[PDB]
Design a protein around this ligand. Sequence first.
Ligand SMILES: [Mg+2]
Length: 48
Amino acid sequence: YRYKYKLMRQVRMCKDLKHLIYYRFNTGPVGKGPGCGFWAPGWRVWLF
RNA sequence: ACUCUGGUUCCUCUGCAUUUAACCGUGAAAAUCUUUCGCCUUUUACUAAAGAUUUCCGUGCAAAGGAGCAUACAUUGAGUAAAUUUUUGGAGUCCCCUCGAAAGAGCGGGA
Ligand SMILES: [Mg+2]
C-alpha cells in the first residue's frame, strides 16, 4: 500500500469477502477462530 | 456417368468478431487526459463520481500450414429407379351431308 495507495481498494474487498465467507462458514458448531480455508475469493481479487 | 475429401488430438500464423437495447468476458483490473467533489502548508502516492481514450488477463469463429496417434470409402457441392371407374395397359374403329383441285371441320348424323 505504501507504493500504491489505490491498492486499498483490494484490501477492503478481501476484508469484505472474509466477512462474507466467515459468517456463512462459522455457522452452527463451527465457531470463531482459524480454519476457514476457502481461499478462492480472496485469491481472485489479487489476480485481477 | 464428374471433381471431391482419410479420422481424430495438438501447435502456430493470418483474417474477422461496431447497425451493440443488451452479450466477443453469466467474470472484472490499471493507467492517461478533461472536469467536479475531499484530504493538504508542495509534489508523488490519493478520495469518488462523470466524460473521452489506452494498456493488460482472457473469448469466439473461419481459413491455411505443420506436428502426434491409432486407420477407413462410403459420402458432401452437382444429380436415379402399381392391367378393374379419376391419368401409365384402349370406348376403339368404320360410313354419309357440307366447304373445296388439294385436306380437314361442324356438341353434324349412322353401325
Ligand atoms: Mg519548490
